[PDB]
């Protein structure tokens, strides 16, 4: 009863047998911006079914030595779908996301992944240089990896210089191969401003880090893909202009 579940948004639907409940981040639902909180005076557009729906990205193959991956959400969807086209033609953006991570495996496999939504996730430079002018900075494509995602060098600090053990202070869910085959989290829109640009700013990141490694026996299936599905939810756009993708 609680294990089984089905979502639906737009024309897309997801069904799960073995799922464990659902995480609603910070106890609030996504909403449209209220009149009091609004600032920009133009009438925002609310596409609904054309934008809000599940989008599936390419799959990551999880291997015994895998170090984990991450994504930036008002990034991955900027070049894909109708959501991506509204984002390039509009200067202002607001929405929440419903997030779903999926990893199958047999009852003979063992391991655990930590799925976490970590707002304002800022990757850092890796090096001992204390001089600000010569200090390393983490690339463009490492900061906004796009649809393909990026992988951690040293997941223990989350590339942020911050302990992964405390990452449970963020909306998070475990996917444990013996318990559940998927993790689901709904994130309301959070930021210091009512709207914000989609192409410049990344509200929050996602982190799938293999805490307990992947282990199995000879003869079992070796290839274990990981797939993420994200639904932009309760979207808004404003500030229409010509397309700027970068």
């Amino acid at each position: 009863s609680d294990r089984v579940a089905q979502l639906t948004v737009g024309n897309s639907s997801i069904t799960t047998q073995e799922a464990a409940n659902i995480v609603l981040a910070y106890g609030e639902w996504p909403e449209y911006c209220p009149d009091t909180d609004a600032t920009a005076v133009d009438k925002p557009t609310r596409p609904d079914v054309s934008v809000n729906r599940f989008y599936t990205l390419d799959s990551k193959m999880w291997q015994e030595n895998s170090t984990g991956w991450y994504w930036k959400f008002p990034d991955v969807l900027n070049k894909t779908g109708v959501f991506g086209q509204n984002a390039q033609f509009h200067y202002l953006y607001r929405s929440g996301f419903c997030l779903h991570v999926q990893c199958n495996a047999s009852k003979f496999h063992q391991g655990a992944l930590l799925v976490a939504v970590i707002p304002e996730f800022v990757i850092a430079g890796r090096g001992s240089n204390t001089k600000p002018n010569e200090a390393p900075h983490p690339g463009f494509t490492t900061t906004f990896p796009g649809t393909t995602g990026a992988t951690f060098h040293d997941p223990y600090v989350l590339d942020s210089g911050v302990p992964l053990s405390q990452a449970l202070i963020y909306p998070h869910q475990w996917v444990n191969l013996r318990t559940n085959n998927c993790a689901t989290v709904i994130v309301p829109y959070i930021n210091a401003v009512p709207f914000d640009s989609a192409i410049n700013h990344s509200n929050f990141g996602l982190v799938v880090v293999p805490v307990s490694p992947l282990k199995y026996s000879s003869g079992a299936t070796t290839a274990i893909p990981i797939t993420i599905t994200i639904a932009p939810l309760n979207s808004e756009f404003g500030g229409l202009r010509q397309a700027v993708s970068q």
């Binding site: 009863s1 089984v4 579940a5 639906t8 948004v9 897309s12 069904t15 409940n21």
Partner: protein, 287 residues
């Protein structure tokens, strides 16, 4: 009371539906343990998943008519159940006889065989002409010969007096002849498949030709001549069409996949099995 044990519904019901079903507006659902999508095909029940549950739909009030698909409009169309060849001039001859079977050939047979049981009335129409297609002012006689009535043995036979057997006299140039027939089976329904034998006794494993035949479907014989004392010299062909009306149908079944080899028997040729489909290039490329 002296002994206790001697002291001792359905499921669904039919709804009258005049038009096709409508659609009601729905929105996204996110919650647990409510899943219209997951079904079990093992139970033998078809998926009850609807539109409104799977994705977001608008409010659609459907005016499309459902009427044309009733079985009573599906068989309202006439078809050719038999064609009989009469040559009055050749040798002696003089009459033609056709034992009534609507399995004679395909299109109408394939329709009626998607139900096991059918009860209905019928309407026969006789289109007669020359081998050349031309019409000539000759009078014809169509006599129906119920099971057990003596068949005509010749053109001059006394069988044609028809004090009992119903007849139709019509000239050949006139419009076709048309009659209504009731439901004449001794049973309560016609049945196009009978698994069993008409009689008791031994059933050889060499020639079983008795097998499969249902006597309740034997309506007797239809005979035709041309009325004169002297034998006319002409060739003639009579096509028989039948509407099928006031029809009821029970326990539907699949259509014939394979070409029909025989009239009374569902035989097929096992080397030629057709694999009803069209061949393709691998999978995962659609045309």
């Amino acid at each position: 009371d002296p002994v206790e044990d001697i002291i001792h519904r359905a499921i669904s019901g039919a709804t009258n539906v005049e038009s096709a079903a409508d659609t009601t507006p729905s929105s996204h659902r996110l919650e647990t343990g409510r899943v219209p999508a997951l079904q079990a095909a093992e139970t033998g029940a078809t998926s009850n998943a609807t539109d409104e549950n799977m994705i977001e739909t608008r409010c659609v009030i459907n005016r499309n008519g459902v009427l044309e698909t009733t079985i009573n409009h599906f068989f309202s169309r006439s078809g050719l159940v038999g064609v009989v060849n009469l040559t009055d001039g050749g040798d002696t001859t003089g009459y033609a006889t056709w034992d009534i079977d609507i399995m004679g050939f395909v299109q109408l047979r394939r329709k009626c065989e998607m139900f096991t049981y059918m009860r209905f009335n019928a309407e026969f129409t006789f289109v007669t002409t020359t081998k050349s297609g031309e019409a000539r002012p000759y009078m014809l006689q169509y006599m129906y010969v119920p099971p057990g009535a003596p068949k005509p043995t010749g053109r001059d036979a006394f069988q044609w007096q028809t004090a009992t057997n119903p007849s139709v006299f019509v000239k050949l140039t006139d419009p076709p002849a048309q009659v209504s027939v009731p439901f004449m089976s001794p049973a309560s329904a016609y049945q196009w498949f009978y698994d069993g034998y008409p009689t008791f006794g031994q059933h050889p494993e060499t020639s079983n030709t008795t097998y499969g035949l249902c006597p309740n479907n034997m309506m007797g014989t239809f005979a035709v001549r041309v009325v004169s004392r002297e034998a006319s010299q002409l060739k003639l062909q009579t096509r028989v069409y039948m509407k099928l009306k006031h029809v009821r149908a029970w326990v539907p079944r699949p259509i014939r996949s394979q070409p029909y080899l025989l009239k009374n028997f569902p035989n097929y040729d096992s080397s030629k099995i057709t694999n009803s489909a069209r061949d393709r290039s691998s999978i995962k490329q659609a045309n």
